[model samples]
Target chain A: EPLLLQDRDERGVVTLTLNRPQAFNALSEAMLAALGEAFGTLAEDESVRAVVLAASGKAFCAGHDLKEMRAEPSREYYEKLFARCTDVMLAIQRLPAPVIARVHGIATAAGCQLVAMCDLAVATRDARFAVSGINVGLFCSTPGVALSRNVGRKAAFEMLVTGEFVSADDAKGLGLVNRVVAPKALDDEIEAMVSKIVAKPRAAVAMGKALFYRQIETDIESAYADAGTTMACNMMDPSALEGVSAFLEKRRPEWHTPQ
Target chain B: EPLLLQDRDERGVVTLTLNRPQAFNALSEAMLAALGEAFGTLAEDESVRAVVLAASGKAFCAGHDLKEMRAEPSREYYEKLFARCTDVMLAIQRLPAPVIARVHGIATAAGCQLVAMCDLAVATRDARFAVSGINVGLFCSTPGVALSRNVGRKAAFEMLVTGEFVSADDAKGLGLVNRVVAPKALDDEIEAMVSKIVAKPRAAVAMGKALFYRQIETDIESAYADAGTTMACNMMDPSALEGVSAFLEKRRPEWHT
Candidate 1:
């Protein structure tokens, strides 16, 4: 059997698929561990320009495997499971490479958390989302932490308390996802966004992504401090040096080599 | 004297009108100090449930009193004035009570900041807003802080740099204000919003406002920790106890007298 995790590379874009169609891509402990390791490996691979996270099933992810959890309920096990889940999510965010969610089906609770945790996501119009742990008397406390940061406070509170599924169009309006497309058009839309980002010099995109996350966390004075240092660091990079000179000289930037 | 601040009480609502029509309700140094003091006072005053920051003039406020500042252009004077301005803006967020900016006419610069700083605001269709300090070379820096928080980066930057006026309808679309009503219908629209909020128990509103500002500054994990503690604090209050009981019993909450 080809591993439950499928990796496909096109040009510089790496597509990672969760291939557990029988369980609706329900995240098992082993699978989550493997995903974390995959992210760690890809982070250092300079040839990779971007990543797409998708699943092969009726659902993108059914979140944590509740059946698996109930079967082997141990304090140590649960702690490790959640810790690795956080690690996988953080790795996606902290990776120098940009990660995009190619969402197709219902993304509920931790599945929705997974979508929001990504740096950017594009979903099909048929997609639905909910932090629905509240229906099970669990209140989606963990997912609420990430959801609230991505959307407006009232919208986040409304979803958290009601556990209602929001349409993809509504999600786009709330800034949860960058764009929404027809179900059949999901791959093309996501690829377009990836292409837009990849067309830019790699170093500028990396610098911008790092700065966007860092600057939002502080007041103006502190943000300016961070900006000055970031600019200084970028100034030393060969890409920045070459790109700036080319622009000043009115010529095309020579960034990439023939593959 | 009907007081420099007029209090009109109706059910649970307390509308505070700044009765300084003589100056067109321009926020002078004295008025800013008074408003700051009022915020601190009202935070502790249990009688006032919600506040409506309205003016008794054709204009909501003309921002800082140019006449007063012109008389004394010293850097120290302007510095103290700006520090107080920041203190006043932060006080609006810090106050447990929800403030509704009932804008009727033009609100420029700091006046625009006042509208944006409030938790919710409603303006008459004829009302106009401008962060118009750039024309005067001051750049509306203080007001930009609030405008930046409320609207998109490019929109806020454009308004500050050009000092252009935005209509009430445009303001609503930009998320700067919640509603825009015809001049005669402003009061009714504000009342509808107030009624909706007043329907919720006071404790929840207070706790929600406090958590809203506290969470804006931190990472998601820290925000959750802060909200958890705040919710617990609300539970300890008598208002929360009464609210929970009323909610379970399906009756109006017996809020403290």
Candidate 2:
């Protein structure tokens, strides 16, 4: 009934499933709002430790809704559509919880962008990915911002210019996806990463994830300064303090479990 | 013997070999200047189509000369050392011709940065790479600049924090090196990539390489604007015109040989 479904497990793992199955979870304007609201809600919730961005239907997602755009054809409306979409993509990065994409099928156009925007991704062997907007005479300029960050220069260029599909194996090889496994094992693989992230001190993971994206965007000198400061702040966190003490003192560390 | 050796094949590929076998080709102060001059020469030489950064010794390079640093260690001296090393690393990127590292041994600290700075690299299977400054209590902050750009975030972080050596295969898998092959085939592999770059229209490769670095560093909207304008300029190049024409006419077009 809902455009987006949110179900939280007892282990503090939140699964946000794109539920517009009939259209393969295209990010229509309404769906963007739904995803945006969900991200904001999770951002304010400290109980949340990790997130799995999953989708349902014949495929994972097919990007923007073509029919919706054709109905209200105007440059002004088109600009708003992409602006809203970009906000949602960035929201995933800003979330304190590490987001892992659980992909099982084709992730095309902005759908593929979703996977790239996530902190990590696990795909099945049969999964396919592409930017695909070039096939329609429009460049995926926004998608390239994230895709190029995750993939090699020439490899990303080929996908953008050619609008060809890369298999899960090829995607992992290109560094677009973190791991590729059998369809039967995809769920377990996603949980494997989610569990590991969930087990770490939440503040450490949050700080590390935040700094990971932050420092990468900066020049080396600025990055080192920022990373150095961030580490200092992290060391002051109670969890990190205890984590360090436990390691140095040679004893088991205690934490509220998320796995 | 010169600190650096220069050789040019008839095909326009210049090979810059670091020649300090006794020191494992350490990037001493003199060695950095030698590299700087070589890069400067290559930049002005339009005849050069590609470059191969090679070394002659048991190891590719052991990074900076620790002995020299220990002899006269000061904040001013350390600052100068890193600043010079950073410039040389960036010079390889600034050079118009694609530079490929021909690696057959260990590349440590700034040595690893050199391979990372090159546009492409080919290494033998036995080659090892690491940024070991963490082991010495001084973080390789400058080396990390060139390194994190090429490798994945977590993998790069692991090496920096742990001070570990990764195999050539691991480097290739991490996108730090372009190719890894057996020692016997290293030359042919490096040549294979060099010849491919050399065979392309020089102007196109030059333009693409420039835009490739430019666009990746900016925000999406600005990058798109810059990329759009860059493509327009590239369209005006004679080689691009001829290259595009060759495809549309269903016949091979002639180019200046």
Candidate 3:
């Protein structure tokens, strides 16, 4: 009965598919809210080792539903919509588990922002990216925030200002995505990367990811101070203690988390 | 003997030359301290619209003299040196006017950090950069902080871990330097850039530089809030009023600090 949602799981990997193929999965406000809630649940689920965000269509996502925006004329309405969009992005970024954007087609504007906010991303060779909102007099200002942080200034600025499409290979070179593969090989490539990541102790990976984001905002002195305190705190956790013990005994580290 | 420092004023650009060619213009503790103080003064100096950090030597800087590091193994000595180096780099970023690094030769270790810290830099084709303290037992951990932020992760990590030299062209490709010119044409190229930048309104340039660094660490909500306040303040300043009034009157606007 549901027209726009599909979920599947295999080998501890959960895949969430956006299913509005006719519209290229243009995210409505309700869709964004539902996706955010899905991600929040996955964050605390121990059974889910990783997440793949994919869509079914010729395009990955055409960005926020422009028809909805065109129908709403109030400034406050637009502001609230964008603010909620930002919340969805921040939720994905702050999630404890890794999220990989699986791109097989074009991702533009807010779709590009979604890719950039993920912890890791892999796209097919033909997948392209752009922030083309400027053609309609709407600046991709919010998208620019996430895009600039992921790629070099010049690369991100060119896309924002000119609304030009850049190839997936160019995207990899700019550090926008971790890897690019043939459309058929996309699943294998992502699996290889996620397998390597999930092999590490989950608690250690979660704490390390949190620390990395926190340190980016401070000067060197404060960064080192934060790292030192965090490291000390991590040492006291049971998983770290078991990891050290396993290393000393030259045996496989038994994770304390229930399988 | 006094350090060989040159001050050149041409077309509203002040070129401060670090002239100690004999030692390859290796920056000593005293020289680093002097440069930091000089930047602080230039921050407030209205006459200075742009800065060209050029050196009269075979190398831009070989970094801190190894002799100075070997002179003492005490913690206090190293602490004072690093603190001052940090101040110099921060000053370059915070200065109202644009500070450009005119690199003509190799800039290694702390020398490399200097170029990375500048707002913009132009390098010669023959120029090189390396943070090579790892060859000795001491790693260039401090310089690594700035260099890592400027270049790609893999490129910066390889350079820091292995202490390898990067070609000038490679630096430009990595976004570490804005431009790379022929070694002999560096002066002329820098002169052209400085002239163009000086032509812009000085207050606008200062405000833009300040806002650029301030907004980088903040979220969009806080960033735009700060920008709104800054825009209102800038509009109220005499410089903005004079410039707007001049545009309305169709003539050159005279600016005053």
Candidate 4:
């Protein structure tokens, strides 16, 4: 079987499913290469409105392939592996189209980090999330970067220290995932959310998504400066102008097609 | 009346109550100055183990004095006022002692910002929180800095845009405050938490508290670098040594008091 599977819907939504069910979708070097190539392909496809990162079988993902890592214990090998991993995580952010993790079962360690790195996530109620590198005698330092940003300070710290599995409901409450539903409803929930994004003018959604992450990383003063000028320019866009005018005119916006 | 009132328990836990009760404890210039001065004073005293920021009257705080703000309509005055207010808010973070906000009633706009700025917060169940500057045609930009740091992004954005009040329970759930209880239990809750913190070695708590905020502001890689080295030296400290040795020895820590 292929390492990954990709599908496209009529609305330009793409689903990339992890196909390593027996390995529990553990991100081996081959799997990482598959993902890197996929995102690079999707990044250029302007017709791609949104992406859903799905995994097959019982577990959503079990994180890195320990079997492969143990084969090369040298410092250089470890360094290269982690660097490649972080780049893939950042790739999700850099992609113009919003990516949502369609999660189920357990997502642990780098698996949990993938969920965190996504712009939005919808998980099954039976799903669990953890950064369990702590249990394996390794600090999930890189994972902590994404986890801490998604979860609260003390909550994130406790999870890192204990390597405990937080249930899907608790994960939603903690802001780790945007929504949680039953396994039967996960796909429908993601579809509904994708429709909302795909309905909006593509360029506007893309720009707004970019600004949302960018401003968050800045100090408030700098954030305001960036937000203000960006907003001023946004107001001048054909899409934004139409939406505003439609509101004032009491008519629905006749927006342009996705670019 | 004094804009701020201060008292101390025998345990060296200081209580600084906002005294502008008639105006719903709005942070007027005088109130801001008083708070700035009070935090400045508390920063110097090593004996001060903890601080409870209590307030008088029906509301916790209603934010800046719009009346005072309107009186000085110049660009320069507005800039100075917000600058002073920002510094006062930051003072809570800078203090060596942990500052816990003891909140009741309503805390809105900069008042809500005050709650977010605190190291920890305990609130009455009926208390309400909002950043309502949007209602007055001004965005709560400065408060957003503190608010975003405390609460999640989408939640904070909704609050800022709507200028709507969030209940104490909801605030706690959003990580805005640490705890919520009945109004009757507010002081006791603050006291119980304060006592736990005060009982720890003063220097150790202070150092760890400082590191907590400092590390959070950095990137994860940098945070780990700082945290790792800081933890290494922390293990070498006299207090940490005693605590660890007590664990291994299997006797009650006849720890040096």
Tens digits of per-residue lDDT, candidate 1, A18-45, equal 8887777777887788788888998887
Residues B123-171 of candidate 1 have per-residue lDDT tens digits of: 9999999999998888999999898877778899999999999999888
| Chain A vs. native, model 4, TM-score | 0.96
What fraction of the real A-B contacts shows up in model 4?
0.02
Candidates' TM-scores? 0.65, 0.60, 0.58, 0.58
Q: DockQ each candidate and list the results.
A: 0.07, 0.06, 0.05, 0.05
lDDT of 3 at B105: 91
For each of the candidates, the C-alpha root-mean-square deviation to the true structure, in angstroms, is: 7.2, 9.0, 9.3, 8.9
For candidate 4, the lDDT comes to: 0.81
Better of 2 and 3 by lDDT: 2
Across all models, the iRMS values in order are 8.8, 8.4, 9.9, 8.4
Clashes of each: 0, 0, 0, 0
> In candidate 1 chain B, what residue range of length 10 has the lowest lDDT sum?
B227-236
Residue runs of model 4 more than 4 Å from their true location after superposition: A256-259, B1-147, B153-172, B175-257
Score candidate 1 by DockQ: 0.07
Residue A55 displacement (Å), model 4: 0.7
On TM-score, who's better, 2 or 4? 2
Q: What is the TM-score of candidate 4?
A: 0.58
lDDT of 4 by residue, A66-168 (tens): 8998886999998999999998999988888888898988999999999988888889999999999999998888889999988888999999989999999
Model 3 CA deviation exceeding 4 Å by range: A1-12, A44-47, A256-259, B1-169, B176-214, B219-257
